[PDB]
Design a protein around this ligand. Structure first.
Ligand SMILES: CCCCCC/C=C/CCCCCC(=O)OC[C@H](O)CO
Ligand SMILES: CCCCCC/C=C/CCCCCC(=O)OC[C@H](O)CO
Ligand SMILES: CCCCCC/C=C/CCCCCC(=O)OC[C@H](O)CO
Ligand SMILES: CCCCCC/C=C/CCCCCC(=O)OC[C@H](O)CO
Ligand SMILES: CCCCCC/C=C/CCCCCC(=O)OC[C@H](O)CO
Ligand SMILES: CCCCCC/C=C/CCCCCC(=O)OC[C@H](O)CO
Ligand SMILES: CCCCCC/C=C/CCCCCC(=O)OC[C@H](O)CO
Ligand SMILES: CCCCCC/C=C/CCCCCC(=O)OC[C@H](O)CO
Ligand SMILES: CCCCCC/C=C\CCCCCC(=O)OC[C@H](O)CO
Ligand SMILES: CCCCCC/C=C\CCCCCC(=O)OC[C@H](O)CO
Ligand SMILES: CCCCCC/C=C\CCCCCC(=O)OC[C@H](O)CO
Ligand SMILES: CCCCCC/C=C\CCCCCC(=O)OC[C@H](O)CO
Ligand SMILES: CCCCCC/C=C\CCCCCC(=O)OC[C@H](O)CO
Ligand SMILES: CCCCCC/C=C\CCCCCC(=O)OC[C@H](O)CO
Lengths: 384, 384
């Protein structure tokens, strides 16, 4: 009760101050919110700790981030760059996987350990990227729409990979029955959202038995995140689709301001909890810094190349910007590593290498993405 | 993760539909939100269960309800009816306590069991009352301001009583050292809020190192709820004070719409969880319905009389309206009963009698308060 209310106060207070600090320094505001969590968490002040309640609030924040981002995104404008989104997603899976596997072989790993290394680099965690895009007011640009589209397909691809790795870790074989169930559920869910995108215009919510348009919008957004999560997709993918279902009507029922209000409250908790979780090891382990630095470079270059090649139609600046946006990694990578520990294919030093990579690809993305965006925008202006 | 996201969806969905239903029936919308929780909870559909995460979200909703209510309330307008707020609060403690104790003696209870019965009737839980006042747009009226003021003092009085009952249940004696620590912390907290009410005008938040006015407002609101809770006061008392600190500046930094957005999201979860918790016993126990009905009548009449006598300066209609608003009971009553079980002063049938009273005073208040308000407003109009 009171404990958890104090914790939230310390997070919001710290995140408000560090946001102000990073604004005044013209650095990415979202990195301030992460630092805030580091400061109040167990690494230093010890006022906030890992817990179930805070982590669920963190999850709601991410959901309302991408729910808000969906609101500002026409589906049709995603479809306009669908072929690029798709390419960016598949190459962003293949290339980091290949580089990770070949590097594994290079450093004496056996076959299965090498495959696990490669698969741990495959999934994008687009939350911090979407926050930056929103922060800089470029959600409507083509590199932004390619990123968001690629993130959705990358999450389907990520779940396929997760399902296969789960099966191998448990049964030792590829569980195609399980894989296909999840592909089916996924493409049906996504494809059905594209169809339900229509009913929102073709039926006004006067005749709908709800307390308010907003109340309807909130139930829909959370429900879509909920349905995504029950399939095994990330909740932020459902939230994003949920937002896009409502984008059409966002002005009419004045949805942007209240949903942005709620994001303003919870999304800082999301990024602050990233900080709270940061384990400032390994300094004791020496091989973790060498292989972990190289794996991080490979993880980043794989995504940066995927974006570059798949989005090259928009130019080198936009395409590298797309690539950087896909670089941050997250939970799916850690889970794969952990399932690898259960399968005997991964050791604790390999785990820490993946953890190291997850942390620094996450911190990397905003620092590269802010100036890359400015660089892309400068070019647009010079071409008039 | 996914489980809890599904649960929230079911609550919001049900609460949105039942809100619509109670609006179309001209019944209190907040009772719809409670019914919603009953329907989706274990009593029927079983889609939602009691849990830590949901209960903390419920708590945040109540906080943002009273935080919003504070925003619409000038401290000066509370002070204008301070003498009535104070009287209403003390009589609303004394009278239900006396009636409960004398009725206890009447039905064969011993001394200590009788005192515990009386003390269980003492505390107001103003959440559902404040929701109704807000719903009907009468937060500025004098009966509303007396209710809110009386609720704050009633929470201090409630904590005194709780602290004494805690001591008796543990040590068998009145722990005056503990009582006075808490009175000191309480009046200092409240009194200090009245002083900090000034600094908000006398210092603009340009020079403040925060990401945004809203972000500052959110940290302040939660922090005040947090500080209240750490003292042992209800978080909604801190939230209410937090809101009042910002009322002055609500228009200038446009705080009303975003804080209302957040209330719209979480407050329905609060009142829906009330429903989820409802245990539709006792039907098997026959004495619970007879003594529980009488205790509920006594609990209501005690508060209704306290409001009537302490607010009589506003007229019979406003004063009865004040009295009804103070009638709903809650957690402090159940805790007292439970501490009574530990002290040997309370039995399970007495507990169920208190539980019965908590439930029906809570459901009672909106049904009486809506027409009483209309009745008071009709009188104002007829006097012109
Ligand atoms: C229109 C807004 C969307 C509201 C969502 C409605 C609730 C449905 C969820 C039922 C339970 C999970 C659904 C599901 O697809 O299951 C797939 C797993 O593999 C097994 O649970
Ligand atoms: C054609 C219209 C232009 C593109 C769409 C418009 C986007 C609107 C959203 C404003 C968000 C800017 C501030 C922000 O990112 O806040 C992030 C969290 O709330 C935490 O503070
Ligand atoms: C239930 C156990 C904890 C789950 C949280 C997983 C993260 C742990 C490691 C430190 C932070 C790494 C960056 C990161 O995870 O960000 C990804 C976004 O938060 C998706 O939730
Ligand atoms: C949005 C990128 C377009 C910039 C065009 C080329 C160079 C000019 C200035 C860019 C500097 C980065 C923008 C920035 O600081 O973000 C605003 C904080 O989030 C709000 O405090
Ligand atoms: C201006 C907004 C208010 C922010 C609140 C700042 C944080 C302070 C809390 C420290 C721990 C509890 C404080 C306290 O009064 O203790 C009383 C108990 O009896 C013992 O914890
Ligand atoms: C002088 C100004 C008049 C008095 C103060 C104005 C009050 C403004 C708040 C509007 C609230 C009405 C709707 C409502 O109660 O919603 C409750 C939850 O959000 C759940 O839906
Ligand atoms: C931690 C254990 C559960 C705590 C919740 C206490 C309520 C239980 C009984 C059923 C509902 C009675 C009405 C009621 O409690 O409302 C009071 C407002 O919710 C204050 O939180
Ligand atoms: C606010 C009380 C002033 C009423 C004056 C005397 C009689 C006229 C009509 C009162 C009926 C109750 C008001 C009401 O239904 O509330 C509005 C829903 O909350 C919004 O759907
Ligand atoms: C009828 C709606 C029930 C609520 C949940 C949504 C619908 C289906 C739930 C899970 C049933 C199995 C999924 C499926 O269709 O694919 C089966 C694989 O391809 C066999 O390997
Ligand atoms: C490269 C192109 C990518 C396209 C991916 C296509 C995936 C499959 C489509 C799913 C269509 C619905 C199937 C269905 O309703 O149920 C399938 C039975 O029940 C499983 O046994
Ligand atoms: C099947 C058992 C019957 C009991 C209730 C369950 C069935 C459906 C939900 C009732 C919801 C009531 C509001 C409603 O849907 O009507 C709204 C108008 O279209 C607009 O006036
Ligand atoms: C200096 C600020 C520390 C942070 C928390 C706020 C201040 C005081 C914390 C608890 C100290 C005891 C409370 C008190 O002053 O009263 C003592 C009884 O009257 C003795 O029975
Ligand atoms: C009927 C009138 C009601 C007035 C209630 C007055 C309660 C007490 C005032 C508290 C003033 C601050 C005292 C303080 O700072 O510390 C007190 C030492 O440390 C305790 O040993
Ligand atoms: C004591 C150790 C020093 C390290 C930092 C801790 C001390 C204070 C907090 C720093 C907050 C930075 C922003 C700030 O407060 O300045 C805001 C201007 O008044 C407006 O320009």
């Amino acid at each position: 009760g009171a404990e958890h209310l104090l914790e939230i106060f310390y997070l919001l207070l710290a995140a408000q101050v560090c946001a102000f600090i990073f604004k005044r320094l013209n650095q990415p505001v979202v990195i301030g919110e992460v630092l805030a969590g580091v400061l109040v968490g167990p690494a230093l002040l010890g006022l906030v700790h890992e817990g179930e309640i805070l982590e669920f609030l963190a999850e709601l924040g991410a959901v309302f981030l991408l729910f808000m981002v969906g609101l500002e995104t026409r589906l049709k404008d995603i479809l306009a760059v669908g072929k690029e989104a798709f390419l960016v997603a598949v190459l962003g899976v293949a290339l980091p996987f290949l580089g990770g596997y070949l590097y594994g072989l290079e450093i004496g790993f056996e076959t299965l350990p090498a495959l696990f290394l490669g698969t741990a680099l495959v999934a994008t965690s687009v939350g911090i990227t979407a926050r930056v895009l929103q922060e800089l007011g470029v959600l409507s640009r083509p590199y932004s729409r390619i990123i968001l589209g690629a993130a959705v397909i990358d999450d389907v691809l990520g779940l396929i990979v997760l399902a296969c790795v789960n099966g191998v870790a448990e049964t030792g074989q590829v569980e195609v029955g399980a894989i296909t169930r999840l592909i089916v559920l996924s493409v049906v869910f996504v494809g059905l959202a594209v169809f339900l995108s229509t009913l929102i215009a073709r039926l006004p919510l006067e005749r709908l038995p709800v307390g308010s348009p907003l109340g309807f919008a909130l139930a829909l957004g959370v429900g879509m995140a909920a349905l995504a999560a029950s399939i095994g997709l990330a909740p932020i993918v459902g939230a994003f689709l949920g937002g896009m279902l409502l984008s059409e009507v966002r002005e009419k029922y004045r949805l942007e301001e209240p949903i942005f209000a709620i994001e303003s409250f919870l999304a800082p908790i999301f990024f602050a909890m990233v900080g709270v979780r940061l384990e400032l090891s390994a300094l004791a382990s020496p091989v973790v810094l060498v292989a972990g630095t190289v794996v991080t470079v490979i993880a980043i270059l794989g995504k940066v190349l995927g974006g570059f090649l798949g989005a090259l139609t928009q130019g080198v600046r936009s395409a590298l910007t797309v690539g950087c946006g896909m670089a941050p990694r997250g939970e799916v990578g850690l889970i794969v590593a952990a399932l690898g520990l259960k399968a005997g294919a991964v050791n604790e030093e390999e785990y820490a290498i993946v953890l190291f990579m997850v942390v620094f690809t996450t911190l990397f993305a905003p620092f590269a993405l802010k100036p890359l965006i400015a660089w892309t925008e400068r070019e647009r202006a010079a071409k008039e």
